[PDB]
Amino acid sequence: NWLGGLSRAAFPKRFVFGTVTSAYQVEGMAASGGRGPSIWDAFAHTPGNVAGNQNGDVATDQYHRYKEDVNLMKSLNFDAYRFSISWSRIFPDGEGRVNQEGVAYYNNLINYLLQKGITPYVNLYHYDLPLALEKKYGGWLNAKMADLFTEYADFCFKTFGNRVKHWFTFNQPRIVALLGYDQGTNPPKRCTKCAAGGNSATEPYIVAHNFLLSHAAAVARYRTKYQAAQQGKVGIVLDFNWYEALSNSTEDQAAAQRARDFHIGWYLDPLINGHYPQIMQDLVKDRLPKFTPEQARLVKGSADYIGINQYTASYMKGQQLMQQTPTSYSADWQVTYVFAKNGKPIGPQANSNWLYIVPWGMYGCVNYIKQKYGNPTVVITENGMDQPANLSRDQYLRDTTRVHFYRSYLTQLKKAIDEGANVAGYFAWSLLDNFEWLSGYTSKFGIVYVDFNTLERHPKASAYWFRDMLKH
Ligand SMILES: OC[C@H]1O[C@@H](O[C@@H]2[C@@H](O)[C@H](O)O[C@H](CO)[C@H]2O)[C@H](O)[C@@H](O)[C@@H]1O
Ligand SMILES: [Zn+2]
Numbered sequence: 001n002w003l004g005g006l007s008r009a010a011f012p013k014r015f016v017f018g019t020v021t022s023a024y025q026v027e028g029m030a031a032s033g034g035r036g037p038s039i040w041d042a043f044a045h046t047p048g049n050v051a052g053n054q055n056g057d058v059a060t061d062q063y064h065r066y067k068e069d070v071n072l073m074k075s076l077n078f079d080a081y082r083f084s085i086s087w088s089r090i091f092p093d094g095e096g097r098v099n100q101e102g103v104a105y106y107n108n109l110i111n112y113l114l115q116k117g118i119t120p121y122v123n124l125y126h127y128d129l130p131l132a133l134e135k136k137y138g139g140w141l142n143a144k145m146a147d148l149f150t151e152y153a154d155f156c157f158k159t160f161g162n163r164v165k166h167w168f169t170f171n172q173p174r175i176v177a178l179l180g181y182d183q184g185t186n187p188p189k190r191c192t193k194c195a196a197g198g199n200s201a202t203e204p205y206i207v208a209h210n211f212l213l214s215h216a217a218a219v220a221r222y223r224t225k226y227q228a229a230q231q232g233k234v235g236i237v238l239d240f241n242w243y244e245a246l247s248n249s250t251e252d253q254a255a256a257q258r259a260r261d262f263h264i265g266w267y268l269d270p271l272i273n274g275h276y277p278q279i280m281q282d283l284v285k286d287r288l289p290k291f292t293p294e295q296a297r298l299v300k301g302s303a304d305y306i307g308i309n310q311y312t313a314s315y316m317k318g319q320q321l322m323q324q325t326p327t328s329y330s331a332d333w334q335v336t337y338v339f340a341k342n343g344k345p346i347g348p349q350a351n352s353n354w355l356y357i358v359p360w361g362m363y364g365c366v367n368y369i370k371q372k373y374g375n376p377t378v379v380i381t382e383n384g385m386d387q388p389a390n391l392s393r394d395q396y397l398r399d400t401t402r403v404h405f406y407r408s409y410l411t412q413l414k415k416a417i418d419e420g421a422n423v424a425g426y427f428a429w430s431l432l433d434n435f436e437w438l439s440g441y442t443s444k445f446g447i448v449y450v451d452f453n454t455l456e457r458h459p460k461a462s463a464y465w466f467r468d469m470l471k472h
Contacts (some may be wrong), residue, residue, distance in 0.1 A: 003468060024126070036092025076470070077470035077472065153218035170215060200330075234304055252317055366413060397460045432448050
């Protein structure tokens, strides 16, 4: 059977199933409804930055169609919806004046979700820093972001927290640090060689540090001011792709572990244990900021659950650790990516070149967090795969590779849960085909097809697979 034995009965009682979008990727109305620009508006409007010079001005127009989309997710038997609030839709300048029209949109969305029995899981931030804050403060390079983010978070808790009980602060701070400040391919386009300036060996670490301090400050505000009345929870969303040693050699096993530490440990060791991973301290040395004891105690325990975005896996080959002149966060790992093992690729690729279909990576990541970090509460906050551009409607809808992807990855998640992993929920990226950052509209991640000419929605086979799997 096409469900492969999966159903709600195959997962723990009260396990949460949802779909995911983010504000810039789906809302549209980017320069309307009072919204101020984000760093992604400026970036996407610059020729050459995004495939086809496309942008999120209109995107899927969820802003005007949200009741259609909520009706659809309910019809597909989902329990929850993960979405984000655009900071610059609430505060066009990032601080100061509130855009009441923006507040009204999120109130309307939240209220309709609840009316339809869908639980809102709300991200405060999903790459979309208000442009005014980048220009005035230097964005995530500035420790003042903790104060600025906390004041924004405070407003959201006050305004929506009587209804919203499941929050996340950030989405994939590793990717902001890596692409924004190491490689310089996402805004603010900083790197050692970059026109905008930068330093690939130092800035990624400063940025990650400020995300951690900002998360901790916002959670301290929630706990001290809002939690007693509202009785909700706040977590953070981290990307984790699996790393598997190429061989059982000491050197290859060490490489795979180094990669895990530089990838997920970078955030999880602070959040769970109150310190950066030892290997990062040892290799990055004075380029890695030091938490004061007080800061470390604020960061430790500051996530009520850990959101993991899980997509893929890589083989890692080792090498003798060397003394080297620092060049970048990426080079600091001292690991060697390799394509294959025993003559076989790790898996076939989806449309995105980085996305190898490797269902056992889901088990790898979840089991690893269980065993290393004291089995914290984890929510799989994204998992999915993409189709290419230029297909026909019918070709998009017959998404048999995505059906197989979800069946296989969910079977591997189930394996980890059955072995005792404390996973509370699972969210598919994405509800809808949408604006996929540098790929623009050339990458289709949705379980629902969006025609970008007419904006019509059409559920794909994978949407009906979920409807069947999730029937109550
Ligand atoms: O790209 C699909 C969606 O997933 C997100 O980040 C991805 C990471 O999880 C993955 O590890 O790396 C790729 C490439 O760097 C990321 O795209 C985002 O949260 C979504 O916004 C994104 O559309
Ligand atoms: Zn519209």
